[PDB]
Design an enzyme around this catalytic site. Sequence first.
Site, PDB file in Angstrom:
ATOM      1  N   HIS B 137       0.797  -1.216   0.000  1.00  0.00           N
ATOM      2  CA  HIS B 137       0.000   0.000   0.000  1.00  0.00           C
ATOM      3  C   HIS B 137       0.831   1.269   0.000  1.00  0.00           C
ATOM      4  O   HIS B 137       0.280   2.341   0.220  1.00  0.00           O
ATOM      5  CB  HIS B 137      -0.904   0.037   1.220  1.00  0.00           C
ATOM      6  CG  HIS B 137      -2.141  -0.781   1.096  1.00  0.00           C
ATOM      7  ND1 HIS B 137      -3.140  -0.486   0.203  1.00  0.00           N
ATOM      8  CD2 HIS B 137      -2.559  -1.863   1.787  1.00  0.00           C
ATOM      9  CE1 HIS B 137      -4.113  -1.365   0.334  1.00  0.00           C
ATOM     10  NE2 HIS B 137      -3.783  -2.213   1.285  1.00  0.00           N
TER      11      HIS B 137
HETATM   12 ZN    ZN Z   1      -5.114  -6.042   3.409  1.00  0.00          ZN
END
Ligand code: ZN
Lengths: 45, 370, 363, 86, 122, 126, 130, 180
Positions: B137
């Site tokens: 992320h």
């Molecule tokens: Zn996740």
Amino acid sequence: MDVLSRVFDLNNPLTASEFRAKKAELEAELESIRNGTCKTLLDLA
Amino acid sequence: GFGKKKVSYFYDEDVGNYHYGPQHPMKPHRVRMVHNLVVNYNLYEKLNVITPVRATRNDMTRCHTDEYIEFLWRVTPDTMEKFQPHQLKFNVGDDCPVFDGLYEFCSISAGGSIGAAQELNSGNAEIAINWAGGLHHAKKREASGFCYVNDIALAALELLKYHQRVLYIDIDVHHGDGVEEFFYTTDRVMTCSFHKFGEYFPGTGHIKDTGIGTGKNYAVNVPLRDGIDDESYESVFKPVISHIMQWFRPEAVILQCGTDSLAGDRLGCFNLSMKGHSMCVDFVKSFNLPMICVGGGGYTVRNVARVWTYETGLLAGEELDENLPYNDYLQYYGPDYKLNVLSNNMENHNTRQYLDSITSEIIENLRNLS
Amino acid sequence: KVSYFYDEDVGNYHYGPQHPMKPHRVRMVHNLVVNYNLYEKLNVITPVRATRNDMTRCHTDEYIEFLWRVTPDTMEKFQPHQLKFNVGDDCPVFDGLYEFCSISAGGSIGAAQELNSGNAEIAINWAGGLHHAKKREASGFCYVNDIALAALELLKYHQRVLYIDIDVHHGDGVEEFFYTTDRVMTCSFHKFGEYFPGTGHIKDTGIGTGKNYAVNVPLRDGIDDESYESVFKPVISHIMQWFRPEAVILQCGTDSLAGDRLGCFNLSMKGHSMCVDFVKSFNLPMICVGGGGYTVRNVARVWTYETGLLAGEELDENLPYNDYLQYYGPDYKLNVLSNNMENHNTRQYLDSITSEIIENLRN
Amino acid sequence: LFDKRRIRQALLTKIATKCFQLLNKQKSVHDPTTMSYRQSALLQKQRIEYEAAVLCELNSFAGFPTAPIIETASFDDIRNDLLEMG
Amino acid sequence: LQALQLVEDERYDYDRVLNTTESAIKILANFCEPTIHEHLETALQELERSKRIIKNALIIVYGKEHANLALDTLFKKLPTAAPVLLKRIKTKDQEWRRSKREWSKIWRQIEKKNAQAAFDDR
Amino acid sequence: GIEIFAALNDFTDAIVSVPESVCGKFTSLKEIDAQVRDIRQNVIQEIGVVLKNEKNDELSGEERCERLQKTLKEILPYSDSKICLATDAMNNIKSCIDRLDAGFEYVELEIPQQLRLGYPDDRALM
Amino acid sequence: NVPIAQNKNPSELEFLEHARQYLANESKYNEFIKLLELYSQEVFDKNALVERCYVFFGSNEHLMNWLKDLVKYNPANPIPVPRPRVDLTQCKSCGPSYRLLPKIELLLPCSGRDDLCWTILNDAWVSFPT
Amino acid sequence: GCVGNSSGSSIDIDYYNIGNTKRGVVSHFRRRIDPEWLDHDNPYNDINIAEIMSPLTKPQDLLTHPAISSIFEQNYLSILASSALEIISAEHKYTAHLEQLMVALLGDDPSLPGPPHEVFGISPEQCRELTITVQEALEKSKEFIRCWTNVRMDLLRAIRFKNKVIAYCQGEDYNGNTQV
Ligand SMILES: [Zn+2]
Ligand SMILES: [K+]
Ligand SMILES: [K+]
Ligand SMILES: [K+]
Ligand SMILES: [K+]
Ligand SMILES: [Zn+2]
């Protein structure tokens, strides 16, 4: 450990005999390490 | 003479000791737990456990920016009263806190991932594991969603020195947006992610997000809904991947093995079990390609420990007994004390027609390929 | 499993300053074969240069020795003897002539030797097939006639050979070589009239025991794909019915395409490749040589297509980036088209000559 | 054991490239071959600008110009070369 | 049609020249090194086997009169004639390549216009 | 005063010069590379059977290596060709790219700012 | 700052003129000028320019202190203070989630990338939750 | 016998000496003002030499100028770079196996502690010859890769510069794509 940071750390021309000398040195060092007697191999080992 | 090939397995004994925040869902401690089982199943005799070479600044800025890595390397939890501009700019402070040893943690993760890439580049292994990695992320300019340095991008770059095509499969319940944004406009890395698309984090991943520029048709999104089970997941997983392997034809796979897509997780909302989750790993392994398997999510640590242990023993080619041997964290695994995670009776929302529709759409998109 | 002969040197020769014949064209062909990844589907060979004893089974030793000794900078002692052997004006003397002749003739004899020993069925020598050179003189851009040597090699094992010729010019050297024998049959489809070499009349069908065993199809201007097909398939079919060949030498001259330097036909890549298709479809041992062709972009594209189609593959339409790519602008496609040049063959004419031929072939 | 084999491989490659690079560097420094980048740039632009005018004039007046001719070296340079070779 | 044929002949003539100078550059640059005086009877054998390429390179760069002169003079005074030839031939090669670029700028327009308007033999 | 773009006019010539050298070399490689692939697959299978020593056990280890030795002796003259071609291509492209780089160093200087940083208001900067 | 293209403030003019004749090599004089350009448009800060300048003016201690006094450098607080963040609401989009970045944003340094990270990695399009 | 006449009297060349160099010319299609000749009889009509060979003088002209725009629309670098990667990859699949055999033969293999000649029974005089040939092969195969990688990386440098310039000379028409 950390091999890559310890194993890793001219346009002026050369005559015939200086070139032959340097080349012989480098080939001899290669054959030295191919059989395990280098002075840089033994220190890290 | 050199016999079979074993699974390389990267572990650094300090990695368990880093602590994000008071009640933070992310606990690196869990990797410690996994190891304490790999030791006590006597698995370590079928692996090659390797200590990672921590990665430096000139290795992390191959993807990130000098200012971001500099802020990482300079900040400390005490002297962050002087960094208040940088907190706003770099998205650090609430969900991605600043803690003790932040930079050392990031170096351990990235070093494991780059080491695995070098292992495959060299020929010493065909599978390589690193459960501390897989922080998918993290953006090039910012931190996002529990991750700080996106090591899958660095692994992929190091893989692209000798392999012409790479495939990145993502089965964390969320969208792997950093690893998509990095390789969005290129046709050398194809990303494929299965996720819960709705009023959900990060909010991206729409089925019509399939790449721009040269990377048109080289991203794949599979937006599912709540409570999906093991057989529905298998029905939507095996066709997509079969056709990606047929038509894209990669040379090296990076498999992210997140485990908040399991039944009973703290954040995720799916309904898989240990066997349903492991089905993906076994199917991907069945293709005989160089493979990396990294960690990911997972916020119920007992479930995560058991599942990653099972999958490690399954990549190594073994078959583990279902009774847990005595280990230092036996009291986390009550009350069955078994190597198994079980599904529940929550209600599925993915009707058969929905799954058929999206599978058809995606397969047309992939037919556009070569 | 198609033998494909190619010597790397042949593309470095040079006929003269503005001559129309460039051996360089052959090199261009190879440069598209490699980049079309046909190198792996073909059994690529390097020809053994032909000796001097190999070349004087057709030709005379005097002419071949003259070819050997001559030289572009020491032809002040040969200059008298030059035109005794027709050398000098459109068959010039250039640097390395004998090497080029040995390369081409060696490719052809090598293909014949491949077919003799079952090592293949189809052989390709794109840098041979020079059908004009006579037994004692050069003739129209050709010095040594390799096709006669290929056929003289084939006839050691096989019993009856068929030589098909779709160069717009007449194949006069070959026809004159085997004009009084029944074991080789020549068939030519050539423009007739006020044209080089001016032979090839529909009543010239061999002498001695060669009577009826030649076939001249004298066409006219502007002919195109459909008329050519309509006159090509009947005669070929009746020849295969009645002659029963065992080996087929197909001459694939490409000056019969639309736009050529010295051509007056209107065929296109499809119209030209139809002949290779149709002759291949009989499942015979087939040597497939080159020939004319003087607009080299056309020659390259067409010969590449015919090789990809003789192997059995299906080459793309676009062209793969290579070294000679800019020769093929501004479209960059493997297609050669035709123009609205007006045909001159009235259907009655084609049918008259076809019937006369076929009535000759019934013996 | 891991690090031992790693070191051996790395050193082998390093020394082999040093050898090859010395060979090439000698061959290339023995090879015989301004005032700025700006100077060569301006020279090329002035030269192109002159040639364009010459060819437009020759176009209007006489015909359409073919490709630049491929000519030999100068008389002076042929002379000097036959000298230094002599 | 004939304008297109002229375009093609011109680029062919550029190509044969550039290819000849390329191969000769290769051989001669091979003959220029420090240790050349040592093993000369081997280099002197790879020169007899390639006399034609170098003869043509000389014919192109000097002319048909000095060609024989340079060929002989290099057959004798090899390990000091080779470098001056190499320098000359490389200069010529560079300038001719530079010229071919700028004229290919124009061949393309010729081919566009006449390729369109040349499929009409009526 | 007013500026001609000499560097921007040489850049477009360098950008064209670059592909041609390596074009010739690339094709010369593809030939060699394509007449060696069978031997390379041979060598790979041989090394695999010699290194596993337990998956294809039909041999006499003394001969299983004489075969590998002969096969390696066969591939040796191709590696030299590849090395010569790679060094040639390396040198050519090196010179061409030194030229192109020296040019781009300047073409970025004589170009107005608004043409590479945008107007001082087309910058979000929250 | 040094915000004009090439002309103002005789102090800066003299300093630029004297910055050569040691950096007389132009190939490594344009680099310094481009870094000054980046500084003046607010990509860097006074603290982040000084370090690359140390790369150029390590020994010539007369020039370096002039520079430090020219940008009002303060050795009390050396943290670099990066460039503020962009708001992608007012940016062109391509699809539901991606936005195009201002042109200047592609001029942040990433000093580990070779010419494989620059052609493979995506630089211009960012992702924005729709 | 005269196969034909290739040289027609329309491509004949006339040389004119300018400065120090002589330039040939096609002089059959001159202005030759007369009643019979129309403009569209000229093949080289409407081929403007003054605007084909003209410089830029304005950065945005890079995208409209005829010849230059025809130059920034070729993708010959993007083909060559991918071809280089395709060539490097097969070679490397071969080199990895050679390298494994090498670490076995030298003896630095963690999973093979004994003497290498024993683990695949061969005379210790056969192992030395095998090791010699494997060493030559491995070294050459590594060198080829080291060179071809530099070739490829410089092609990539060229591609990067080209795209950067195409994006600079677009001003406010910059939508992320730069495929001319
Ligand atoms: Zn996740
Ligand atoms: K996912
Ligand atoms: K992609
Ligand atoms: K006959
Ligand atoms: K004929
Ligand atoms: Zn003909």
